[PDB]
């Protein structure tokens, strides 16, 4: 039900895969360049407008469940033209903040409930 | 019958291993002179430093088996039992219990022992301040708990210290007034002056005086957002003081940078909403400092946003002599020659500069005096 | 735990056995908290409680360990003759209240985070209704309206209506509408779920999701609804991209929405920008205007700040009549807080009310 | 545990021993709700049920701990004479209903989330069918038809027909159509699966995925299907 | 468990002891579907099968827990004459049919999303 993850083990810019309830979970320690770029976008382009602070509480750490939101298949990080996540099923592109920017996907990747424990993070 | 009456006359107390009192009492009894203990057990503390250096220390504690001590002229029977079935998974060790037995004709004489144990813990309260920073949406320690600095150490202009102290005390004492009115219980104090006037040092000293932690936030930070700003100043830790610095970042450009998308985004709307609306009101004291008051906006000096403003300019000769004797306690009449020397010098000097030139060598006061003629341009060389 | 704490405080008892329970919280600043409490611990004890002798026997298992508490299991066995009142209920209820002596009723304020709500700050202390001053009739009118609505619940259910209420509080700003909503919610024992449509990137789907998955026992407060209507014609050419949709709001208001006695309070400062289409039964049912400060408001608030100083209020009302100016509630409040216990000074600086927006 | 709760309710016992079960809920506002029940607990009790004497023997495991609740294992052992009717069935039944009576159940509204179906708000209370009115011959005209379809499963299945049925309600102005649908679904005890074809960002493949893979015993409702017809590729001729 | 289920329905049985097995499903809509089954439970039992009396025993193994099931380790046993046909094979075959009757052989249709098939 609850999965506990050590945050310190993750270096900057490195993604992770974690199974909560069996659902995949992505942990990314964002770099300031990513923060600036993501916050600098124009919401009009986004099919599902939302802001980085409202996607995730901590700009340092970025969380979501790895599902395309088009079908049940999972995307892959560090892929796609936008440098975020890409889906190899029907070519849905996700920006650095896991926001659908191009493709048939209707919604951004949803975020589960999570809590920060300093060195570690509790997801659930 | 014999056992029943025995237990009827005597108190018997138990201490599980979980309680800190267990270890505390073990340590205390190890120290007690009037002791008859023929059993011992070693406890060794290890910390292997990063470079391989290791610090070692050991101590002998009574350990399992019965003992005999006399406390305040009353005999006591210690009995340490080692569990033979349980493993305290939290401590990764078998469960233990140290039990005491005593006649109840006298009082248990036992809160006294545990107060003695408290005395070991009381020594650890020396650390008395912590700095909190906006690591993200919340506040976290910026570092090791700093040591508190005494208020007379920081020397501002006469009256400013007393006025600020009196005003903050007045605000804090009459909380029931705010509760009765229904008005939010928060107040603001604005410190404006030239740079290097010891404003932040003054705030830190005050926080030391009232024991509250300090919550630092710089509005020149380029990745602040008004929503996260409003979150932070309402999710603040208890017993804290919020210190805002370079509020002129909102005055000078306002939303111009926000529209341009260049560096920080915080603006007046963030100030207003995060000051009054939907804000934490149980308790809060906020401090603002601004190096460029000239860009002030007439909408802010109103109650609910801020109420106290005070100029902090160049150090007066009173401040000069006070800090001179701070660096050089005693040393009378050297301060006199110094003060008139700087009066002949007759230029604007920040307290930071005076501190620097009194500390740069750990000087003798006359040594600082000798070069005091260069204060016209001492910012260049020294 | 409750019963052990309770019996530790019982004067009429005998307990040969005892055990220590320590409270140890290390403050962040370096200070520390310590507190002892010698509970009876294992063994047997006797207690006489309003005439009845009870034997108390505490024991811990020698083979169980509780995973949660990380400690061996324990039980407390009371025993006494049948002929009593089954006084265990009395003892145990007494133990209940003493533990819950805190009486910590607060008023939480939630806030939207993505499609879900999140607690915002610590639970604020309750603020009672009289703390906020409004014009005559408006307050009590709203109170009786909402009371009638909640009480008349079965009426809605049986007669095929989804049992939703909508109250609009429109008027010039600086009238403390939000403060009044907070006071009302605290009075009714209801949490508040703020959601400002202004300057908030809301997608109508997400808006509907938030308003309908609201936590139970919580009042929904939409702030500045007119922003949506403004952006119906503005953002189409401006690009504020925080606009939501009016049609989505209607669907998010009526379509398939919640029905759990949901009560919604909406506020605005530009009623002209609103249209007479969202106004219907089941969405904005009872609206009221909230204008600038009135004589009633100024008298009542002056008494709130200076109880018993009726003559001083008379001089004050003479002064403000002499000024004969229009002022909102918030500006007039500043006079009395900066003169906490000095009403005579507020009387002295009545002329400054023209420039109240700058320094006062 | 329903047996314990029922036994607390049943009078005419000899319950010398007792045990407290506490429910403690911490509301976010600070207040807490507590309720206090005295259940038989360990030891041996007696019952006189319908003239039959039943002995009840609670037992607490001396070694085990149940991970499911982090508590020692327990057993409840009834005992009586074979000559009885084996009233155990009766007492278990009339204890079961007490648990059942607490929660009758309601109607749940599902809604689309990407490809998945998930609940949308707490279970809405059942809307009784008479509570919505329509023109004469209409409501019954649908009700009888759906009942016939419900019973004609054999008429479809044994002859290899797709056991599906589709309805259309094309009231122009909009008069309680959705209300009628929800009332009918509650009457049949079927959860409602809502979907609006006017929703932006709805693809044919995702639709086909969603119209199937529905939650069990659910009625699908497609609102304003005319969007599919009208909103042709001209609006998205670029490939939107 | 199939064996116990079969025995519950076997009429030529003498069983002084019983145990309650509950199948409970909670629907998402709040409606609950419940059933009870009086399996033999612990203690001795006698059953006649094909004219042969087969003693039966059930036993809850203390000092054990089946971690997967999360219950005390149970064990059942039967006993009868070696001289006459040990009909245990026949008994098990009978019990197996009680499980096999449940499935009618549903057809399952898979569909391709991504480079893998899944249930549809
Ligand atoms: S399922 Fe991933 S792009 Fe469509």
Numbering used by the authors:
A (entry chain H): 92 to 215
B (entry chain A): 75 to 456
C (entry chain B): 97 to 456
D (entry chain C): 97 to 336
E (entry chain D): 97 to 216
Paper text:
For bc1 complex (complex III) assembly, the iron–sulfur protein Rip1 must first be imported into the mitochondrial matrix to fold and acquire its 2Fe–2S cluster, then translocated and inserted into the inner mitochondrial membrane (IM). This translocation of folded Rip1 is accomplished by Bcs1, an unusual heptameric AAA ATPase that couples ATP hydrolysis to translocation. Here, contrary to most AAA-ATPases that form hexameric rings with rather narrow central pores, Bcs1 was shown to form heptameric rings with a significantly wider pore and two large vestibules. One protomer consists of three domains, a transmembrane helix (TMH) at the N-terminus, a Bcs1-specific β-sheet-containing middle domain and a C-terminal AAA cassette.
